[model samples]
Target: RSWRHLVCYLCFYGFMAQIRPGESFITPYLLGPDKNFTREQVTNEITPVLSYSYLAVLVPVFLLTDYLRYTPVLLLQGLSFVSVWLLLLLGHSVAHMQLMELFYSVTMAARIAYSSYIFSLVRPARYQRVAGYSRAAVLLGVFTSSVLGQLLVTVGRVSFSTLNYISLAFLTFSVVLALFLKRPKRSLFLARMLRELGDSLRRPQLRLWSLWWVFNSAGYYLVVYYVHILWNEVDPTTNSARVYNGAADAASTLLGAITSFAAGFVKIRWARWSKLLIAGVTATQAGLVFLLAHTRHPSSIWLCYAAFVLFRGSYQFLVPIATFQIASSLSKELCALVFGVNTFFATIVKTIITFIVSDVRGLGLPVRKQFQLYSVYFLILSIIYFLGAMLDGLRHCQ
Candidate 1:
């Protein structure tokens, strides 16, 4: 109902539409768009460099987010969105695209700034509701983008440039919406919290959270980025780029939309049960990965795909709920900083997982074999969930 809430919703939706596709599709886009490079080259030679750029920018942005106004950060994010598209539209060489990726990573730190901005504008007591609202918006956006992308790639036979233009248009709209937001109070107390998070890598809680994040993300990203690659390998000529892309888009979007709508009701009526349910689903998802690894025949691909759909649907629940839990536990002034810290650690883990997966692939193992390694990764995630449950159970016993 509030204008500030509306602004947050708009920004959150825009980001949700872009984030999954941007990170998941970028490597393939680079490989397809740049004539000189192969997929392996893009994944190995270029991706890590861009990831490191993101990591490098994260700390400084966190340190400065509280001190700076939200308007500038929003403007910067909007402009980066425009710039990245332009580069994709016009750039020819790998170097040019890599430069574009670097700028994109730098601008991504605005995400941290935006989280801080939202906390400053909204009341702490409303944090859980806000998280649910924001997350639903995000999932809806992702569903829209994925479906639209699939339509463009498969049904329309459109090129990646067309998609970039569409993304550019979305950012233009976001920039317009951002202008309505007022500047939040600049607080020294908030700045100090940001400073602490910037230095939080040394803290025990941060370290534990980071370890958990790394394993969780490693499992998630492996499935996200490589699933298409595996599909292509299954029936190389029969599975055109568009078909595979469209299939993934349709599956993910269909599940995401249904889950997003359902999550709203779940948050209201089944909040406590949702966490336990998510843990159970995630564990089942791990078992599914192991099942997928052993599946070789084309007939079994659909089975694996089904597992992926369920995994993705369940995982979407964790994002908003986790944010709600963390935000509620923290003081009003410190919420943004806490979220920033969470994002920083999550990204660090993702980067590590990227490299570990790459190294495994370099050994010339088949896709199924590579996925077998991921089974171990998922087992580790299941353990983390079990530990969290155990700790909670013990607290109840006291």
Candidate 2:
């Protein structure tokens, strides 16, 4: 089959892989009758396992993903998916769910295997476009699942257990599809891994962009981790049955899909504008976070959350371009390696922040206060970028 065929296959795999109906409602599911997990257990204990397990496995997976070729890692990823949902369906205790989180983290870390697999299927020039195509497909799946989950919950009165069952089936299908993927047969990049990674970071654009990924992503995920809690805080309703978690998730994913697709077609002189654009977008995110933090009205909070997702979606628009630019000079192996390094560092920041802000052992700020800190976090991110823009602009002028 042609390489285009492989791209289509990978896209479909990605699309189907993301169609987990229970994902948006994960907390509710755990808090519901079957699991009866406490919010503190779900947030402070179980959720933290994902980052720890992810950090534990990421480096080793990074080392083996290329050497083992793509398919094996994808297989491990698929199995991790199956294991997580299976545990969610069967296991009830905090420790059981912690194991689920570890498996879930495997699924998360193995994602780079899929993205890097795309690189092997096509020429480097098509990287930006294909990344967009793949990302849009994945977002479409997220949107579809979110919409379906919401509809089923609100209209069909589907139980969370039933939703988890549906999600498990979808996960199985994705794993079956993963098995069919053509194994790319190329090997050996370990010898130069560290030196090449060091050299890659030595480049200014890659260095700066990678730094952006590390800092912004850490803060962004921290917000995401607690958003539903914020929603519950402001909701003013006690009825879990009436929650619209999936609807908001659907709206954001729809916008995310559209903006991600548009990213490929929208052209800009990135070298000249990259810093300024990141600064402006980050400043907007800071404002949105502030709005989200203070808005007690459910409707306004929901809309602010969507707008936050939209701006974040726009940031995703920069990612493929950044990936293309950074990977333009590196071997496929090094490209994956560098991103793995970036993700590891980002996770380190996320874990530390999670500990200090959310973990019970640390300060464990309340949900509302946590978001207030997040708003200030984004404010600092924006300031850093704006200063970088000013410095780079002045350098060019001289």
Candidate 3:
């Protein structure tokens, strides 16, 4: 009853917490008449707050998640979602929306609780299998919500507000679920964890994967954050029937789930080819982003965007592998700290890019120009990775 029941409870909480139906269409709703926000307002004023606030709370939440143990932060995540959607539903001003982003950032940061929670309850031998189950549960939750939202919007002619209310119900249930999770008996101290981090960083494989996770994840999420605005720009038609963001999101998530699952079965000499493989996949992603940025025809633009999502699923493929690679030798508590720090660094990189490229204080580029810059960002990442791979191969040759 202990290990297996714990998995069921946590997976249920993970799944329900992620069933955010309104997320896919949020940009459209904000741009719609209910919100009456301009593209400029949504882009520069509202969205940048998400990145900045995530950067602000991530490290503190990471520490607090460990300090209070995972259950408190998991509960905090649920409460935070309640605040975010409450504001989204009721609040009118840009300030109100900005507050929502702040709460949403807490939700994002505290998600580490769910990912880290499972390990503390179960044996290290079960880590790989249980991680897959929990990840799949979350992805399935997203896929189900996305499909439901698309069906309601397209078939039942449901309004975005109603969709958000449904999401609120599920989010509230997530809070109730969090209350029942068993609290772990042990935790970690900052000084020891920091020392362990230095030790872990010295390992070549762990260092390589964590580096890819930080930079690549930053660029990847930046694109996810803003790509819908690009869709609205390429096709200005606002008819609800044609708005397929939910459908697109569902496709990406399902494909990502499949590829990530498949990633488990494929055996590679990771020591030899990991760098080149990541470089190749990243290089392909750069081209897809370029195509997504440039395509004008509405259908073609959607196709390019789907392709971008499909290719970026490789990141999902890499996640569990990276987790195993980095955590194989570390204690479960230390595992959480390492991942928490990696995510904090990723948030830092993401925040800097948001400040430079998207924020009004910085360049304040339009969607088209923002995506153009994003394409180049990936291109440079791939080049750096490719060169590193070459250097390693050259050394091996000798």
Q: Per-residue lDDT of 1-398 in model 3, one digit per residue for the tens?
A: 66677778778877777777787887788888777678988889888999999998878887777677777777888888888889989978999999989888888777656766777666778888998888778878878988988888888888778888888888788788778878877754458877876776777777788899999999999988888888888776467667888888887888777877676676344645788988988988888888888888866765766766765676667776676677786876677667777888898999898999889867998889999989999999999999998998998988
Global lDDT scores for all candidate models: 0.62, 0.77, 0.81
Candidate 2 TM-score, true structure as reference: 0.86
Q: For candidate 1, report its TM-score.
A: 0.72
TM-score of each: 0.72, 0.86, 0.91
Local accuracy of candidate 2 as per-residue lDDT tens digits, 190-294: 557778777766777777777888898888877777777677667643455588888877777666657656766753445557888888878888888887788
Q: After superposing candidate 2, which stretches have Cα over 4 Å from the reference?
A: 1-12, 33-35, 121-137, 188-202, 236-241, 266-268, 298-301, 331-333, 392-398
Query: Model 1 over residues 1-398: C-alpha lDDT tens digits?
Result: 56666657555645643533333344455555335565555545555556667878888866765567766766777677778777866778768877777887777667656555666656677766766666566556656666666665666665665556666677667666656566766543347765754554454333433454445754685576566656545543332243445455667667766776676565545555543555676788788778767677866666767777777776765555545544444456666556555567767777776656554344534456767888887876777677776777888888
Candidate 3 Cα outliers beyond 4 Å, as residue runs: 1-7, 122-132, 185-199
Among the numbered candidates, top lDDT falls to 3
The stretch of ten residues in a row with the least summed lDDT in candidate 1 is: 235-244
Per-prediction count of colliding residue pairs? 0, 0, 0
The residue-level lDDT of candidate 1 at 216 comes to 71
